[PDB]
Ligand code: CLA
């Protein structure tokens with residue numbers, strides 16, 4: 001393991017010492033059977049990869065293309081412009097937009113949904129390869145995404161649960177703190193008490 | 194091994210006596226764990242160098258040029274690029290400026306970061322030893338480098354606790370004290386003695 | 389027509405992958421489809437509650453015209 | 462020959478796409494796993510006449526064997542997406 | 554061996570093993586071993602806070618009321634609830650909680666696993682330890698005591714801790730009643746001992 005999440009606790013037995021990002025953190029004893037664990041290894045990967053790509057879309061378009069991650073993207077369409085993406089206007093309209101989303105994802109995911117192998121799913125390689133394929137380099141990079149993903153997921157909450165408290169977007173809510181760290185904190189808010 | 198810090202003997206058992214200038218100093222006994230002392234041998238020498246590099250730096254800022262240290266960023270906080278280092282101001286802005294010192298330094302550390310040997314990393318030699326003054330004896334020079342280092346670090350604190358106190362930057366303080374010895378002290382105007 | 393679900397092989401795959409329920413739902417489609425009383429216990433329990441559910445809505449949401457005018461009905 | 466008659470024609474092609482594209486994989490894979498029976502025996506040999514599992518209507522020369530009732534099962538879903546898109550006009 | 558009262562018990566489950574043990578546990582909280590271990594630490598953590606803390610109450614109010622020299626801002630120890638200035642009580646509080654709870658979970662997970670809170674790789678840097686169980690030593694004993702007076706020193710920590718805890722409770726209950734500061738409560742009694750006693754005011758005075 002690459003460290004322990006809580007120094008002073010022993011390693012849990014059921015988690016085999018070799019897993020990507022094994023800190024021995026399983027407080028609820030969720031998976032005590034390695035059979036069932038594997039599906040959640042595969043799944044923690046996916047939830048991260050979507051979560052990774054989701055974060056820049058929330059920050060950037062607040063501080064770059066100038067829209068919130070929540071109300072701006074969706075609202076502006078109904079009562080307004082079809083899409084402003086990248087500060088540009090495409091043809092595509094509301095209803096027939098989501099129709100395309102099912103053909104593709106349902107085509108993209110279901111094509112992945114059918115595989116015999118667990119490992120070749122989580123880690124397809126193939127056409128996706130053009131990077132380290134070998135030995136410890138891949139084994140190490142294997143840790144790096146699992147680790148960034150955990151951080152990336154754990155951000156997504158902070159995006160939602162700041163916006164429900166503050167109401168401002170993530171960067172607009174960030175910039176407030178770096179200007180004045182005290183008085184702009186979370187403690188003073190409708191969160192704590 | 195030279196003498197001991199206080200002459201109460203009891204040189205602590207654990208130590209690589211050839212280490213560069215151990216006076217047998219562990220009031221708190223931190224390095225008792227040998228695998229851990231392996232780390233703290235480098236943490237020292239790499240701290241001191243950046244004191245050893247900074248202490249003269251903080252010395253010329255206030256002496257030759259304008260600003261002491263905390264004056265430097267905020268003088269150019271409204272200024273930005275307008276520094277003068279033997280020369281004028283190549284244009285850069287705070288966000289753009291930090292990218293250099295963050296990224297160029299990251300790799301420079303990252304190249305040193307993973308070094309299978311703990312001796313090989315802190316004392317590489319070679320390209321970082323252009324002169325070759327290592328000669329056959331570095332052990333005199335190694336201790337030599339540390340005694341300059343420890344003092345450099347310990348000097349750095351003398352900048353920060355003075356200026357954080359009512360006292361100002363050292364260069365004038367140095368002159369201020371040597372102007373009037375009685376009335377320029379940590380006690381006087383320093384309000385370091387809280388009575 | 390062979391397209392659809394199988395009652396039993398819906399059930400038999402629901403044993404939770406821990407063992408909290410042990411075998412989970414296993415050979416229940418046996419007991420159910422054989423025991424009548426099991427089928428009748430559900431029928432009365434399901435229809436019984438609805439009888440009450442009718443009475444909870446039907447006074448407060450008086451579907452029929454000109455009730456809640458004559459009260460005693 | 463306009464959008465009302467075009468969309469349902471353009472919508473249904475979505476579901477029949479996925480059905481043959483991939484989900485012919487997974488539907489056929491559970492059907493082989495799932496077959497009805499009672500008292501450990503299927504419903505034909507337990508004495509029920511009407512219950513004989515009926516493949517003799519279900520065949521095709523289609524490349525994968527995609528059959529009439531799978532057209533019915535997917536085409537009906539094609540008509541779900543059909544009458545959700547046109548009929549709502551709710552928040553775009 | 555000293556007893557709390559000389560004629561009673563020294564309960565079976567309690568021998569005179571640990572220091573500061575006079576044989577008083579009427580409600581018999583500690584019985585099984587793995588509990589008594591816990592409470593012993595719960596005592597010292599109290600005993601240590603109480604000592605330090607009480608001096609926060611005692612001395613500042615003493616200075617002010619012992620003369621003009623350095624009058625204590627915040628007046629009596631319960632008048633220092635006011636006088637926050639820089640940061641709001643919303644933030645400064647949750648800065649504490651986050652900051653303390655780091656150190657004190659480190660203290661617990663040590664009691665759980667005694668040998669090392671943190672072995673040398675984890676929690677980068679730091680981790681000097683040098684830790685015996687029940688007392689940190691290490692950093693926390695800089696001058697290097699435990700020079701052979703330990704057993705006595707141990708008795709002197711508890712016995713002063715026992716008293717500062719008990720004495721602290723007075724500061725609470727006194728101020729809750731007489732509404733004055735301790736030296737006000739002090740001197741007024743020492744001035745005239747009878748009329749200024751307890752039990753002439755508000756509390757036993759219910760009679
Ligand atoms: C002049 C004041 C001063 C002092 C006294 C120190 C002292 C120290 N520095 Mg240091 N440092 C300084 C200025 C100073 N630094 C400056 C100005 C910079 C930036 C240019 C740095 C950047 C720096 C780095 C990048 C590293 C150190 C490290 C260390 C520690 C090495 C000791 C060790 O290995 O023992 C065992 C290790 C210990 C840490 C001993 C514990 C002693 C105290 C109680 C720990 C305090 C740590 C601190 C509170 C961490 C929180 C701050 C941070 C998370 C924001 C030591 C505590 C090393 C380290 O691990 O610390 C970060 C290290 O790799 N220094």
Ligand code: CLA
Nearest residue numbers: 154155157158161162165173174176177184185186189191
């Ligand atoms: C990657 C994690 C992360 C980071 C960097 C931030 C950063 C920020 N949050 Mg935040 N947040 C997060 C996750 C995160 N959040 C999550 C998951 C939640 C839901 C529980 C919240 C709920 C939250 C509220 C309700 C508010 C903020 C606010 C803020 C801003 C002020 C800091 C503050 O109040 O702390 C927020 C407190 C926390 C994040 C507590 C969680 C701390 C965990 C245990 C560790 C976080 C550090 C982590 C290791 C990453 C930092 C690495 C370090 C090197 C920088 C700042 C931009 C405030 C703000 O901007 O005010 C206008 C504000 O009102 N956040």
Ligand code: CLA
Nearest residue numbers: 214215216217218223224233234236237240343346347350
């Ligand atoms: C952060 C800088 C740093 C670090 C990592 C070390 C590390 C080391 N020193 Mg060292 N030293 C330093 C600065 C440092 N020193 C300075 C500035 C001086 C001059 C006073 C010395 C003088 C010195 C002597 C004389 C000896 C050592 C020795 C050692 C080794 C064992 C002691 C130990 O575990 O220290 C670990 C260090 C730390 C955990 C850093 C803690 C820093 C805390 C966080 C700050 C405290 C600041 C202080 C309270 C206020 C300022 C007061 C002023 C004195 C600075 C070890 C390799 C002994 C040895 O074996 O020789 C190599 C020895 O005999 N050092």
Ligand SMILES: CC(/C=C/C=C(C)/C=C/[C@@]12O[C@]1(C)C[C@@H](O)CC2(C)C)=C\C=C\C=C(C)\C=C\C=C(C)\C=C\[C@@]12O[C@]1(C)C[C@@H](O)CC2(C)C
Nearest residue numbers: 578579580581582599602603606609610630633718721722
């Ligand atoms: C720690 C403590 C007090 C700590 C006080 C602090 C930090 C004060 C802080 C402040 O002042 C400052 C610093 C500055 C001010 O501006 C702010 C405040 C905040 C006001 C009291 C413990 C107080 C603890 C007390 C009084 C315990 C008494 C226990 C007794 C009498 C016996 C208990 C038993 O356990 C036994 C021994 C045997 C069992 O069988 C029977 C029973 C009864 C269970």
Ligand SMILES: CC1=CCCC(C)(C)[C@H]1/C=C/C(C)=C/C=C/C(C)=C/C=C/C=C(C)/C=C/C=C(C)/C=C/C1=C(C)CCCC1(C)C
Nearest residue numbers: 473474477532533534535536537538539540541543544545
């Ligand atoms: C031979 C040939 C040519 C080239 C190759 C190719 C493979 C394409 C092949 C394809 C041939 C074609 C076009 C096959 C088309 C088959 C189709 C469209 C069959 C139709 C299926 C739909 C059916 C039963 C209807 C099901 C139920 C419906 C609607 C009801 C909808 C409902 C409405 C909206 C009102 C009430 C509620 C409810 C029930 C939801």
